[PDB]
C-alpha cells in the first residue's frame, strides 16, 4: 500500500522531472559503434639517444589513428666504486650526501641566529645549536612556537654501505623538453616540471605513476633498491589526442606530413645522486664507468586500425580538432617580491606555478618546490590584468589546495599551485571557461614568497609557470596545422 | 584480411548496437557554450566572530551567480606555560592528556574482571591486570580468543614535552551549525557532525580535505605539529549550488532577497587538547591566554559573471532548481537499545547515523564515533516504516561498508552508517531514487548497540541521524523561496 | 570592459562551439524519473554450506528486478592448543610458518651459489651465506648489483606467541567458483582468481574491498588480530546485473525460469596458516576442533521495486540485455617458456593473465603472483592471431603497468597482466572494442618467463587466463537465455 | 633550427642527417662543431699511455 | 606592435652582475621601418 | 630577461653588455665580460612566451 | 587611480608610463615614490663592501 501510495503522490513539481520519462532504470539500452582495432608498437628513435643531447623519431604510420603515446626508457642498473680502486677515476661529477648542499644552504640562514661557539663545537653540540637557532630563526620570521630539539633530530636512517641511485621521478626528469611536430611545425612542447605538475592535479587515485616514471614518494631506500638493476619506465606523454578516444590523431588525414617527437634529454650528471663525492659510479652489467651514450629510449605508440568505411570517411573530412597546446614562463628570482609578466596567448583554460630553490636542484632534488626548511615558498600571490586585480591577494594555501579541491582530481604533495579560469580544465573535448590572453595587453602574477627567497645560497631560485591553452589542429586535403 | 573480416562479421544482433552508428571514436566532436568568468572574493562577517558566539555575513553581490563557498578561518599558533608562572591563570578548562577521560571510562567496563590487588598494585601492575580484565572482558562479552598482553600495551610515544594542539578536523569543528539564508527564510542546514560524515562517505581519493580542514587521521603529533603556529583553513561548504555548476545559485534572479550565512561557533574549551591539567594555553605570537575573540573567520566566494545576453535570460526566467536539503535527528542513549523516531519530512534520497561516545566527546575526540575499546558501537539495525520492516535487522558491517560501496565514492574510516534509497544520492541533478517521509506516518530506526553502550561513564552518549531530501527552490520576480 | 570584450571577441572557429549553445552552466537542468525502491534481502542456501563442498541456493523473487548480489560469509574466531594438550589431535593439515615452503623453494634456487661448508654452520652463519648467495646468484641471471647483506636480512617481527589465522582475502578464496544460472543455463562463472584480479584492476581508490574480503595488504598481524573473533565478510559478485541500474536482471520477464547461484567452497587445510606445525586450530568460541562444517554463507540480494506501469512495460517487453561473460584457460608451467592456446569464444573485450608459484599456493598465500624471491614472473610476452603477432613481444611492465593505465580504473599491486581491445572495458553498457575469438583459428599468448620458474620445487606451478567476453541475454514470454 | 645528426658523429666515421621540414624553404646551413679543450700529460705520468 | 610580449632571456657567464659588477648595463636596439610623409610643406610620421 | 616594449615592424635588433668596472675605467666600448671572456653564455627570444 | 610603470623604475635609467583611459578627463598628477629605509655598516664588517 506505502509504496503504489508513493508512485500515486505525484504533484504539478514532479512532472518536470517524471513526465514523459526518456529513461528507465529497469531496462539497460546500448549504442552500437563502427569496427576499430587497438595496436601497440614499439619502434627506436631516428637519431641516436644520449643524455644532454637532442634526439628525435619519426613516428611510422602503422595505423589510421594515433592514441596512446609512451617514452619507453630503458636505465641501467647502478654500482659504485672508490675513485683510489678505478683505472679511469675521471667521470662527470654528481650531487653527494656528504656534501647536502640543501642543508648547508637552510644551515646558512639560520647561523645569525647561532648563540655560543659554533666553529669549535663538538658535531653533537654544532647539530643541537643548529635546532635551537632554527626555533629563534622560525620565532622572529613566523611566530612560530619553538619546538622540542629531540622532534627537529630526525636521522634519516641511511644505510651504511655505498651506493648510488636515480633521481626522484627520473622518467619525467629525463624529459627536459619534449615537442610534438607535425610538417616541420611544432603543433605542442611538454617540460619535465610540467610533466610533474600535471601528475601532482591530475593523476588519479590508484592510477598515479609512481613505478612507470620511477618516483617513490622520496623514499631514498626504494630509489637506492630500484637503481642497483636495469630499469625499464614507461612514461606517457600527454598530448591533447592522448586525453579521449575521439581526438585520436588523424594519421590518414595528414598523409603529407611527417608526424615527429623530439626530445632534449637530461645531462647525465644531473640524473644520479650518490652517498660519497669521492665515489664513482658503474654501469652495473658492463662495470665501466657511467656515461652519456648508457641512456636508452624507444616510442611506443598505441595505433588505431578502422574499418575501411570509417577510415574513407576521415579521409575525406577530418575537419577540425580541439586542442590544449601548453605554453611556459619561466624565470629566475633573487628577491622576495616576484613579479611574472605572463607574455601567453589564446583562450587561456588555466596555469600552474612552483617555485625550486637552487640549493634543491643543486642536491639533485629536481621536484622539490618547498622554501627554506621544507615550508611553503609563496606567502601570498595575486594575479592582475591590464593592472586590476582578477584575483586580489590570496594565501598559499588557497592557490594549492582550494584550487586543486575545485577543479582537479587530485591535490598537490608539492609546493603547486594551480589556477582555472575553465569549470572542468581536465575535460579535453568541452570548454567550461577560458581568459583569452591575445587580448590582454598585461597579464601579471605577483608573488610575496618566504623570507630570504632567493637571497644568498639560493641566488637564481626558478620560477615556473605553465599555461594551458585552446587552440584548433585542421586537417585538410592530406595536410595538418594550427 | 582478420581485422578485416571482423568488421564484415556482422549478425542481426550487431545491428541493435552498431547500425546507423550516431558516434565515432576517431573524430572529436564538441559543442561550443556561452562566455563567462570565475572570480574568488574574500568577504568579512558582518558581526564579530567569537567562539561558542553565532555570527552572521551577508552575502556580496559581485557577479551574477554564486557557485563555490568556503569558510575561510584563521586560528593562532598555540604555546603552554605553567599556571604557577603566570600572572592570569584562571582560563577555561581543557580536555588534557593526563586526564584521559576516554581511557578511565574504558577501564571502569573491565574493573569487574579484574582479578587480584588492583588498588595497592604498581603502575606497570595495574596496565598488566587491566589487559588481562580487557582479555577476561571480550571473552565474556564477544567470544573473543585473548590477545598477548605485550600487543596490547600499545605505548603511543607522546614526546615529553609540553603542547597543546587544536582537535583534529578542527575546521569542521569549529562550525557547530550553518544555516544559508535567503529573504530571512532558512534554505539550508548544515552540522559539525553531518560535514564530516559527508567528507567520509562522499571524499573522494586524491581530494581528501586533510589540510584544509585541520585534520590527520588522528596523528596527534602532526596536530602538535600544526598548531605551533597560525594556521589558515579552508573550510568548504556543501550546499546545493556548490555541487554543480547549472545549480549555481542566481543572484540576478533573487534581487530583492539578502543571502545570507549564519554560523554558530563551537567553545573555545571544546577545541583545544593539553598534554597536562595545569597547563595555561597562550596565544603564540600575543603571549595572552588564549580568549573567544581569537576565532577569525572570513568568506570566500566565487562568483560568476555572465554575457549580457544570458544574464538577461536568467533574470527574465530563472524558473525552478532541484535543491537538496539536510535535516536532522539528535537524541541521547542512555541503553544498549535505542530507537530512533525519524520525523523528516519531503522525498528522503538517504539516511546517514552514527553514535558519539559521551567520554570520547568529553576528551575532546568530537569524530571518534567507536564504541568501547574501539570497537564498533552497533551491533544490528533495523528500518521500519509503519512499524513494517523495510530493512530488516541487519548487522553494522552491511550498513557502514555494503551500503558506502553500493552508493558512496569512499568507505568511511570510522564508524559512520548509511542507507540509501537513491541509486546515485551524490548526482546533484539526477533523481535516481528517493522514500516521501511526509507520507509515511511513523519511520522508526532501531538499533542494538554494543553491551554497555550508554551505561556509567557513557551515560548521555549522542546517536545523530542526518537526511538528505529533494525540495524546489523557485525564482520569480526577484524573489527566491521554497 | 575586459570581460564583456572577451564575450565580443568571436570569430568563425568560436561558432563551431558556441554558436545556438544547447547548455547554460548558470542554470541546472534536471531530468524526472520512474518511482522505484531498493530493499536488502538475505537469504540461505537451499544446501548445506561446508568447506571443499559445492552449495546452491534459487533466488527468490522478493521484487521485479535483481540489483547487487553480496555473498555474505561468517567464519569463527580461531584459537590455538598444542596437539598434546588436545584430546583428539587429528585435524587436516594447515600450512606453518615454521615450514615455510615458499622461503625453503627459493633457497633451493640459490643453493648452487653458496660457497663454504653450508650444512655445519650455525643457524646466523647459514642466514649470512643464502644473502651472500643470493647476490651471486642475482648477478648472474640479472647482471645486479648486489645488495648489503643487512638489507636483504628483513626480520618479520613474528610475535613469539601461538596464533593461527584466515589466509589474505579469504572471502574470494572461499569462492573456488560461482555460477549464475538461469533455468538451468550457466550464464555466467566467476573464479577466485579472476575475483581479485578484477579488484586489483577495477577497484576505486578509497572503495577497495579490504575489510569486506579479509585482505589486509599482506600484513600478517592484522590477519591475525581479525582470526581472534567472528568475521563476517560481504564478497561482492560483479555480474553483468550488479554494474549498472540499466542491466538490473528483470525478475518480472524470467517468471518461468529458476535463478539460481551455485558455489564451489575452498578447502579448510587452505583457508588457514599457523605459527607451528604441531598446533591444532580450534573454533574460539565453541572450543573444538575446526571443521568442514564450521563455513556459514548467506546471500544478500538488493531488489529493484517498480511502478506497476514501468513493471507491466518490462514484462511486456524486457527484449536484450548485453552481457559481459567471463572465460578461463588454467595450464600448469613446467617451464620458462609457455605457450597458452586461449580457445575463448565471442567478441573478446580484453583478457588478463598472471601466474602462480607451487610454493607460494604450498604455503598458504593464494594470491601471492610473485616469482623467484619475489621477483616479476614474466620476462616478456607476445600475443598471436593465426600465426601472426597481433602485440609483438613486450616486456612484463608494459602489460601490467602501462595497459593498466590506459585502459583501467587502478594499478595492480600483484603481477597481474592485462590486454584490452576495448577502448573502455570498464564501461559495461558501451561496446568500445573486441576482437571475435570464435573467427580466430588459434589466439596463442607466448610467455618467456623468469629463470628456473617451474623447475624443481616449483615444477606444477599454475598459469591462469581469464576473458572478459561479450554476449546477449534474452528475455522472451517469461523465459531468459543467452 | 638546431638539429642532432641521425647516426653517431666521430673523428674518422661518416654520419648523416636527414633534414627536418620546420619551414616552407631552406636558406643559411651551418655545421655547428664543439671541440673539447685540450691537455697534455707525460706518457709516463698516464696509467694508459696508448 | 602586434606582439603581446617580445621577451630575450639571456644566460650570463657566472658572477656576471655581482659585487663590484653591481649595476652592470645591458642596451638593446632596434631598427623599425615607418613612413615619412611630405605634404604642402609639411612633412611628419 | 628584457621586455622589449618596440614598436612598428622591426627588421633587426642589437644587444651587448657594458660591466660598471669597464664603464667607471673609462673603457666605454669594453662589452667584455669577467677577463675579457664572452659575457653572454646563452640566449633565447620568446613572442607571447 | 594609481597605476604602474610600463618599464622597470631604476636610478640613474628613464622610465615611461602610458597612462590609462580609465575616466573622460585627466586632472591631478602625482608621481608616487617609495624609497627604502637605509641602514650603514663599517666597510670591514661587510661581505661584499663595492
Redesign the interface.
Given at each position: 500500500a506505502?509504496?503504489?501510495?508513493?508512485?500515486l503522490?505525484t504533484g504539478s513539481?514532479?512532472?518536470?522531472?517524471?513526465?514523459?520519462?526518456?529513461?528507465?532504470?529497469?531496462?539497460?539500452?546500448?549504442?552500437?559503434?563502427?569496427?576499430?582495432?587497438?595496436?601497440?608498437?614499439?619502434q627506436p628513435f631516428?637519431?641516436?639517444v644520449q643524455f644532454g643531447?637532442?634526439?628525435?623519431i619519426t613516428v611510422n604510420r602503422q595505423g589510421?589513428?594515433l592514441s596512446?603515446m609512451?617514452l619507453?626508457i630503458v636505465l641501467p642498473?647502478?654500482?659504485v666504486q672508490n675513485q683510489a680502486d678505478t683505472?679511469?677515476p675521471t667521470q662527470q661529477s654528481f650531487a653527494s650526501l656528504d656534501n647536502d648542499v640543501a642543508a648547508q644552504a637552510d644551515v646558512s640562514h639560520v647561523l645569525p641566529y647561532i648563540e655560543g661557539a659554533y666553529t669549535e663545537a663538538s658535531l653533537n653540540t654544532k647539530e643541537q645549536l643548529i635546532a635551537e637557532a632554527k626555533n629563534s630563526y622560525e620565532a622572529a620570521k613566523?611566530?612560530?612556537?619553538?619546538?622540542?630539539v629531540?622532534?627537529q633530530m630526525q636521522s634519516t636512517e641511511m644505510?651504511?654501505?655505498d651506493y648510488a641511485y636515480w633521481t626522484e621521478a627520473i622518467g619525467f626528469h629525463l624529459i627536459k623538453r619534449a615537442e610534438f611536430?607535425v610538417?616541420?611545425?611544432t603543433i605542442d612542447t611538454i617540460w619535465s616540471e610540467l610533466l610533474f605538475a600535471m601528475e601532482e592535479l591530475m593523476?588519479?587515485?590508484?592510477?598515479?605513476?609512481t613505478?612507470?616514471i620511477g618516483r617513490t614518494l622520496r623514499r631514498p631506500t626504494e630509489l637506492m633498491?630500484a637503481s642497483?638493476?636495469?630499469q625499464?619506465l614507461?612514461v606517457?606523454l600527454p598530448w591533447y589526442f592522448t586525453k579521449?578516444?575521439?581526438?585520436?590523431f588523424?594519421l590518414v588525414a595528414a598523409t603529407y606530413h611527417?608526424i615527429?617527437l623530439w626530445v632534449q634529454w637530461a645531462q647525465l650528471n644531473s640524473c644520479i645522486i650518490k652517498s660519497r663525492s669521492n665515489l664513482v659510479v658503474l654501469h652495473?652489467?658492463r662495470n665501466v664507468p657511467i656515461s652519456d651514450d648508457h641512456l636508452r629510449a624507444s616510442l611506443?605508440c598505441?595505433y588505431?586500425?578502422?574499418?575501411?568505411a570509417?577510415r574513407d570517411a576521415?579521409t575525406a573530412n577530418?575537419?577540425?580538432?580541439?586542442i590544449v597546446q601548453h605554453?611556459?614562463?619561466?624565470?629566475q628570482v633573487s628577491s622576495n617580491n616576484v613579479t611574472a609578466?605572463?607574455?601567453?596567448?589564446f583562450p587561456v583554460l588555466e596555469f600552474y606555478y612552483f617555485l625550486r630553490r637552487k640549493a634543491n636542484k643543486d642536491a639533485g632534488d629536481h621536484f622539490n618546490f618547498s622554501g627554506i626548511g621544507g615550508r611553503d615558498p609563496v606567502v601570498s600571490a595575486e594575479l592582475l590584468?591590464?593592472?586590476?586585480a582578477?584575483?586580489?591577494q590570496?594565501?598559499a594555501?588557497?592557490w594549492r589546495?582550494?584550487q586543486?579541491?575545485?577543479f582537479?582530481?587530485?591535490?598537490p604533495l608539492t609546493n603547486i599551485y594551480s589556477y582555472?579560469?575553465s569549470?572542468s580544465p581536465e575535460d579535453p573535448?568541452?570548454?567550461?571557461?577560458s581568459?583569452?590572453?591575445?587580448?590582454?595587453?598585461s597579464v601579471e602574477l605577483a608573488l610575496t614568497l618566504q623570507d630570504d627567497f632567493g637571497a644568498a645560497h639560493d641566488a637564481n631560485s626558478e620560477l615556473f609557470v605553465f599555461?594551458r591553452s585552446y587552440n584548433?589542429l585542421k586537417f585538410t586535403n592530406g595536410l595538418a596545422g594550427l
Amino acid at each position: 500500500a506505502g509504496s503504489l501510495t508513493q508512485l500515486l503522490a505525484t504533484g504539478s513539481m514532479d512532472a518536470a522531472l517524471t513526465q514523459n520519462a526518456t529513461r528507465t532504470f529497469w531496462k539497460s539500452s546500448y549504442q552500437k559503434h563502427s569496427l576499430f582495432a587497438l595496436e601497440s608498437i614499439n619502434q627506436p628513435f631516428t637519431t641516436q639517444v644520449q643524455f644532454g643531447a637532442e634526439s628525435h623519431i619519426t613516428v611510422n604510420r602503422q595505423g589510421d589513428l594515433l592514441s596512446w603515446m609512451y617514452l619507453k626508457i630503458v636505465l641501467p642498473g647502478l654500482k659504485v666504486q672508490n675513485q683510489a680502486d678505478t683505472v679511469q677515476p675521471t667521470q662527470q661529477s654528481f650531487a653527494s650526501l656528504d656534501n647536502d648542499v640543501a642543508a648547508q644552504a637552510d644551515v646558512s640562514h639560520v647561523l645569525p641566529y647561532i648563540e655560543g661557539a659554533y666553529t669549535e663545537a663538538s658535531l653533537n653540540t654544532k647539530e643541537q645549536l643548529i635546532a635551537e637557532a632554527k626555533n629563534s630563526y622560525e620565532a622572529a620570521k613566523y611566530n612560530a612556537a619553538p619546538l622540542p630539539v629531540a622532534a627537529q633530530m630526525q636521522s634519516t636512517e641511511m644505510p651504511d654501505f655505498d651506493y648510488a641511485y636515480w633521481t626522484e621521478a627520473i622518467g619525467f626528469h629525463l624529459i627536459k623538453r619534449a615537442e610534438f611536430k607535425v610538417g616541420g611545425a611544432t603543433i605542442d612542447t611538454i617540460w619535465s616540471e610540467l610533466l610533474f605538475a600535471m601528475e601532482e592535479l591530475m593523476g588519479r587515485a590508484g592510477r598515479r605513476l609512481t613505478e612507470t616514471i620511477g618516483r617513490t614518494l622520496r623514499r631514498p631506500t626504494e630509489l637506492m633498491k630500484a637503481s642497483r638493476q636495469e630499469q625499464i619506465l614507461y612514461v606517457p606523454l600527454p598530448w591533447y589526442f592522448t586525453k579521449h578516444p575521439s581526438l585520436a590523431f588523424p594519421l590518414v588525414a595528414a598523409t603529407y606530413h611527417n608526424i615527429q617527437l623530439w626530445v632534449q634529454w637530461a645531462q647525465l650528471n644531473s640524473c644520479i645522486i650518490k652517498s660519497r663525492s669521492n665515489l664513482v659510479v658503474l654501469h652495473a652489467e658492463r662495470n665501466v664507468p657511467i656515461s652519456d651514450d648508457h641512456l636508452r629510449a624507444s616510442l611506443e605508440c598505441t595505433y588505431v586500425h578502422l574499418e575501411a568505411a570509417e577510415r574513407d570517411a576521415l579521409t575525406a573530412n577530418a575537419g577540425t580538432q580541439l586542442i590544449v597546446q601548453h605554453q611556459a614562463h619561466l624565470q629566475q628570482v633573487s628577491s622576495n617580491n616576484v613579479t611574472a609578466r605572463l607574455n601567453f596567448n589564446f583562450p587561456v583554460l588555466e596555469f600552474y606555478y612552483f617555485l625550486r630553490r637552487k640549493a634543491n636542484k643543486d642536491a639533485g632534488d629536481h621536484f622539490n618546490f618547498s622554501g627554506i626548511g621544507g615550508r611553503d615558498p609563496v606567502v601570498s600571490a595575486e594575479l592582475l590584468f591590464n593592472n586590476t586585480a582578477r584575483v586580489t591577494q590570496k594565501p598559499a594555501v588557497w592557490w594549492r589546495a582550494v584550487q586543486a579541491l575545485q577543479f582537479h582530481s587530485s591535490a598537490p604533495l608539492t609546493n603547486i599551485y594551480s589556477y582555472s579560469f575553465s569549470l572542468s580544465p581536465e575535460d579535453p573535448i568541452t570548454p567550461s571557461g577560458s581568459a583569452n590572453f591575445s587580448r590582454l595587453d598585461s597579464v601579471e602574477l605577483a608573488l610575496t614568497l618566504q623570507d630570504d627567497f632567493g637571497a644568498a645560497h639560493d641566488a637564481n631560485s626558478e620560477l615556473f609557470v605553465f599555461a594551458r591553452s585552446y587552440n584548433i589542429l585542421k586537417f585538410t586535403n592530406g595536410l595538418a596545422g594550427l
